[PDB]
């Protein structure tokens, strides 16, 4: 018994309609006629909210812009006039075949115009250096779409295996993302080099952007 949700990722222009597919390898219709398929929305930071149950019924307090349909194997969730409160992951869940199972989810976000990140770089603090470690931090602020690439250079040498990054959730007001990347070195390695640089690639940038500083000044 397998469930496939489609699409995996869905950008939606505010006010436009959205259509989500949930398909099952086996029928979800009981012989009494009911289809045991439910839709759930999970917003960032929240537990899932039931939207639709028994395939076609809105749950209590669910706005009428959400509607479910389908019978047998193929099911649809339509969202008309999508807004920032609708952003999150939508899971279908089949309740006919034991053991019951969630789909893998469709991620819905607000579509907006392209926005290149503003890029900021932060040297390690004197206090951190005292303790024998150097973390350099790169911030990519307010960009869209979510895909961005950061490449750390040390005296122009490409770094790998010594950095980690983290991205925020979509901002509800401007529909952007922000990302931070942290390069970590020992004090010893850090003091053997001069130029520390964060090189950034994004759909909004015609060519890569480098933010750098020189150790000391």
């Amino acid at each position: 018994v397998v469930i496939t949700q489609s699409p995996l990722f869905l950008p939606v222009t505010p006010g436009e309609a959205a259509s989500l597919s949930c398909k099952c390898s086996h029928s979800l219709q009981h012989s009494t006629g009911a289809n045991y398929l439910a839709w759930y929305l999970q917003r960032p930071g929240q537990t899932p909210r039931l939207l639709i149950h028994l395939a076609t019924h809105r749950a209590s307090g669910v706005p009428d812009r959400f509607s479910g349909s389908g019978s047998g194997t193929d099911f649809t969730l339509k969202i008309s006039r999508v807004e920032s409160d609708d952003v999150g992951t939508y899971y279908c869940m089949q309740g006919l075949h034991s053991p019951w199972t969630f789909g893998q989810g469709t991620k819905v976000e607000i579509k907006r115009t392209v926005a290149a990140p503003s890029v900021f770089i932060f040297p390690p603090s004197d206090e951190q250096l005292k303790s024998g470690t150097a973390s350099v931090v790169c911030l990519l602020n307010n960009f869209y779409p979510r895909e961005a690439k950061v490449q750390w250079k040390v005296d122009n040498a490409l770094q790998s295996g010594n950095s980690q990054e983290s991205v925020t959730e979509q901002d509800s007001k401007d529909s952007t993302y922000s990302l931070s990347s942290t390069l970590t070195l020992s004090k010893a390695d850090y003091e053997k080099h001069k130029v520390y640089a964060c090189e950034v690639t994004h759909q909004g940038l015609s060519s890569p952007v480098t933010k750098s500083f020189n150790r000391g000044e």
Binding site: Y36, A38, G95, P99, Q104, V137, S166, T168, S178
Partner: protein, 240 residues
């Protein structure tokens, strides 16, 4: 509006076992089915198992067959889920929940000479009330409060009348950590990033904020970091 209360966050070594508990206001597990669902950071919902409120049916996902026990005390006052043989893959938030089912007669054969032949099945209609969850972290790491370092605003973090500044919250265990700026007074333009898990088994995160360049000479910026697991409370002033 039943409320579910779950047991507190736990850290467990790979190879051990956790027993999570759940209570429902008004002893509602007597009258409403219990479900267990887990979710790892950044990943999907995973149904674990359930027990009918009648107490006559229990089931598990295929993946938890031989791994999980779902039980309840008499009078259904507390419900428990035990997961054994933990690995890093079991690091997740574990949710307790109520649900509704349809208990339906699937098989019926008329018997003229005594009681009928019947078979009944349970079908899941809704998941209803979700608990707040129990964070289980599978790791051999030791509890550790973060170091907090300033991300100082400079000419390399300033342009077009706006500057960025932040705090780096380095090397803590376990999750969670909370960050505010100027005791909650500063919220506009704050980005507090999800933690990353480092090779050492410790977490790190950063919080940044964009502010008017103008204000760097006059406005004070302090990040407030709270790591309850280690009772660590740090206020760090961030200077130019």
């Amino acid at each position: 509006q039943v409320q579910l209360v779950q047991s507190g966050a736990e850290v467990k070594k790979p190879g051990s076992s956790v027993k999570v508990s759940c209570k429902a206001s008004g002893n509602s597990f007597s009258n409403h089915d219990v479900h267990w669902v887990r979710q790892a950071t950044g990943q999907g919902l995973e149904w674990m198992g359930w027990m009918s409120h009648e107490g006559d049916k229990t089931g598990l996902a295929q993946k938890f067959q031989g791994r999980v026990t779902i039980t309840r005390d008499s009078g259904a006052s507390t419900v428990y889920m035990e997961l054994r043989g933990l690995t890093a893959d079991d690091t997740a938030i574990y949710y307790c929940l109520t649900g509704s089912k349809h208990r339906l007669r699937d098989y019926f054969l008329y018997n003229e000479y005594g009681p009928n032949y019947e078979e009944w099945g349970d079908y899941l209609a809704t998941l209803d009330v979700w608990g707040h969850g129990t964070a289980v972290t599978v790791s051999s790491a030791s509890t550790k409060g973060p170091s907090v370092f300033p991300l100082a605003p400079s000419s390399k973090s300033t342009s077009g009348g706006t500057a960025a500044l932040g705090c780096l919250v380095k090397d803590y265990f376990p999750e969670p950590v909370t960050v505010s700026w100027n005791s909650g007074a500063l919220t506009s333009g704050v980005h507090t990033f999800p933690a990353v898990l480092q090779s050492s088994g410790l977490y790190s995160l950063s919080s940044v904020v964009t502010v008017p360049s103008s204000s760097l000479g006059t406005q004070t910026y302090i990040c407030n970091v709270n790591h309850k697991p280690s009772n660590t409370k740090v206020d760090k002033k961030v200077e130019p």
